[PDB]
């Protein structure tokens, strides 16, 4: 009889999805001023008597600041050399080390290179998961969760995935410059003449309106992945969620009466991640933060 666990006065919110199955919805919010990262993760548990395995739907959202900066290169001679640092690739990952836990799905599953991204994950009673690459369809599942994020001029693709981990990467792709398209590897990307030898470092590079949101502001992630647990066995398990970025450098040295020289330092600062360690309590269906960096 007494099988829904909690403490006195808990805020336990559950969605009854029909039959002897329900969904226990939990959320956690972690911020970090050091890394400029906010993790707004939803933890939707799947209680189902017709399912012989515990299930946890993790929807990872939030915001990862672009960490873009325009600076002068201090020192004599570098009075006409300016430096731009911008994010080349955003990192979202979920890794675990519990042997009794394994990942059963993840969205996006395949590399997608459109400006907008909208995908759905559905659940039918009995342990049936299937994912549709749209937010189209009306009420085929007992419970559905969607992902939604825009990645202008970037490309979302899976980098690592197996039974204990999954890692995405939103790499830079193609940009629209006033003189045609420019690839993400064009060393002369984002550089321009600063109109004289007194302009600011900011004037040595493209305006803010020629920069996509992922370069100016940042990236709002929206990734889903589900993990299964064998009933019994382990009562608690841990996993880590990484929100990060990779930074490139684009120096723009100005030469008078001649031209503006440019060169790119690719992957100068990698793994600029904010990793948070969570712990699941499969008995009480609750999440808690163990720590972060």
């Amino acid at each position, epitope marked *: 009889s*007494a099988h829904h666990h909690h403490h*006195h*006065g*808990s805020n336990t*919110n559950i969605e009854n999805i029909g039959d002897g199955a329900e969904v226990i919805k939990r959320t956690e919010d972690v911020s970090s001023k050091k890394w400029g990262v906010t993790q707004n993760v939803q933890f939707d548990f799947v209680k189902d008597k017709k399912y012989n395995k515990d299930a946890l739907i993790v929807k990872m959202q939030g915001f990862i600041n672009s960490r873009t900066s325009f600076s002068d290169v201090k020192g004599s001679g570098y009075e006409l050399t300016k430096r731009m640092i911008w994010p080349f690739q955003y990192n979202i990952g979920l890794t675990t080390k519990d042997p009794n836990v394994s990942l059963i799905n993840y969205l996006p599953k395949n590399k997608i290179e459109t400006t907008d991204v909208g995908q759905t994950l559905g659940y039918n009673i009995g342990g049936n998961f299937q994912s549709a690459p749209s937010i189209g369809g009306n009420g085929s599942f007992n419970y559905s969760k969607t992902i939604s994020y825009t990645q202008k001029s970037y490309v979302s693709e899976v980098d690592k995935q197996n039974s204990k981990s999954v890692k995405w990467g939103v790499k830079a792709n193609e940009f629209v410059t006033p003189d045609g398209k420019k690839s993400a590897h064009d060393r002369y990307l984002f550089v321009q003449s600063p109109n004289g030898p007194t302009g600011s470092a900011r004037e040595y590079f493209a305006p803010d309106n020629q920069l996509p949101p992922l370069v100016q502001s940042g990236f709002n992630p929206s990734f889903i992945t589900t993990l299964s647990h064998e009933k019994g066995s382990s009562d608690t398990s841990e996993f880590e969620l990484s929100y990060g970025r990779n930074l490139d450098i684009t120096y723009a040295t100005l030469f008078p009466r001649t031209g503006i020289y440019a060169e790119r330092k690719h992957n100068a600062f990698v793994n600029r991640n904010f990793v948070v360690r969570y712990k699941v309590n499969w*008995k*009480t269906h609750e999440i808690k933060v163990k720590g972060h960096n």
Partner: antibody
Amino acid sequence: QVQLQQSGAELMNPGASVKISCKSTGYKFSSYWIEWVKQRPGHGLEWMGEILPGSGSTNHNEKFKGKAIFTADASSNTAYMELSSLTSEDSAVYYCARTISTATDWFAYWGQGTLVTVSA
Amino acid sequence: DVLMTQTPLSLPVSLGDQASISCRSSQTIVYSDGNTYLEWYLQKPGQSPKLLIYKVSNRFSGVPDRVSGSGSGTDFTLKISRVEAEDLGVYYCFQGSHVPYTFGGGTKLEIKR
């Protein structure tokens, strides 16, 4: 306008049933458990059970597993409890209690109580 | 479904003395989150139960300073500094960390006029 305002007095013949209310204001149930407590006149306080309304998922004590049924209506703002096979044992006062934990401070509300008399 | 054994059953106390109520659980009340969810309730006659102290020690809004609760593990104690004629009634210890929830045997506090 009292947070948990219960039903009035009641008289039901033995063997029958009765369903009492617990009209609940307070911001949002369907997320916060509401429990029921029984008090014999012999100074005995006994915890019956609770229910999460928005889910209907109940959680009761084995003593009242065959004697108490918990329901709740999200359309209005009420939760109910029904008692089967009324005997002289079940003649008591029944309170409903809600409690909210939050992070700063802590709330605990109770109802005035509903008297249930089992006679003919 | 743990047992809650209160002691004493009847505790007389004069106007100004100190009254202490012990309550011991048949299992450690510590929940997996780390907090011990023990509570003390006061039911004056003809009224609904009123909460005094939540989570062993933390006092409730509107509780006088004479009240203080302590304890650890399974044995707990509620103490009243300067007992007054308005504090009489029945005191119950309640556990809220393990379902099903259970109350205490009740402790009747009478005055000595």
